[PDB]
Amino acid sequence: RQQLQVLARYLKMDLDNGERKFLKEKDTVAELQAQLDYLNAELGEFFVN
Amino acid sequence: QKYASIVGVDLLEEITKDHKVLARQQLQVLARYLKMDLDNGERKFLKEKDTVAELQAQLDYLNAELGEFFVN
Amino acid sequence: RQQLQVLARYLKMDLDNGERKFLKEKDTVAELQAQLDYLNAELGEFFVN
Incomplete structure (x- = not known):
């Protein structure tokens, strides 16, 4: 070694x-998942799909 | 210079390498x-970097659908 | 290693x-021994000695 x-x-x-x-x-992933998890919380899974 | 214009005349480190190899x-x-x-x-x-590309594509789509005004 | x-x-x-x-x-030996073993087969050990 x-x-x-x-x-x-x-x-x-x-x-x-x-x-x-x-x-x-892995930080930029965490960040973009937080943006996307928010839009799902706002619009709902039905609307986003 | 008029004449010339008419007639057409004119007026080492392959050892440092082999070690590092x-x-x-x-x-x-x-x-x-x-x-x-x-x-x-x-x-x-x-x-x-692939999972980033993928999540940015999902998010760029929602911006295309809803618009930047609505998302902000 | x-x-x-x-x-x-x-x-x-x-x-x-x-x-x-x-x-x-070792191949050229094999070859020269084959030449010499032949002359012994032809002439005989008595004649060669």
């Missing part, structure tokens, strides 16, 4: 960049 | 040994 | 080149 970490550092290679980008998208 | 290959075998997917992050992310 | 393999690749160093060259010679 420690040897991997120094090779990653040498190659200028962020191993978390993936999980970062992902956590940031 | 070695380092990359060594990293890859350590990753394999530790049972450690380096793309698992970007996978999970591409899959979420 | 895997680490050795990437160092070998980097140094442009065939680890089998030895056993190749050898298998190829």
Whole structure:
């Protein structure tokens, strides 16, 4: 694990960049679901379908 | 310049690479040994960017139906 | 073993080149023994000795 970490550092290679980008998208999903769950609360499932 | 206009005359870094290739290959075998997917992050992310696309399409439709005035 | 393999690749160093060259010679031996075993079959061991 420690040897991997120094090779990653040498190659200028962020191993978390993936999980970062992902956590940031999971927030925009949460946000858009909140907008859409609201319109369902206002208009009703019958009207939206 | 009148004459010329009439007649038509006129008046290194393939070593730094080869090392970084070695380092990359060594990293890859350590990753394999530790049972450690380096793309698992970007996978999970591409899959979420699809669910965003999908929910934006649902929401862009309700705006097309009801209008921006009504939704706001 | 895997680490050795990437160092070998980097140094442009065939680890089998030895056993190749050898298998190829063991064939030329087989071939020359077949020529010599034939002359013994024709002339006889008494005549060849």
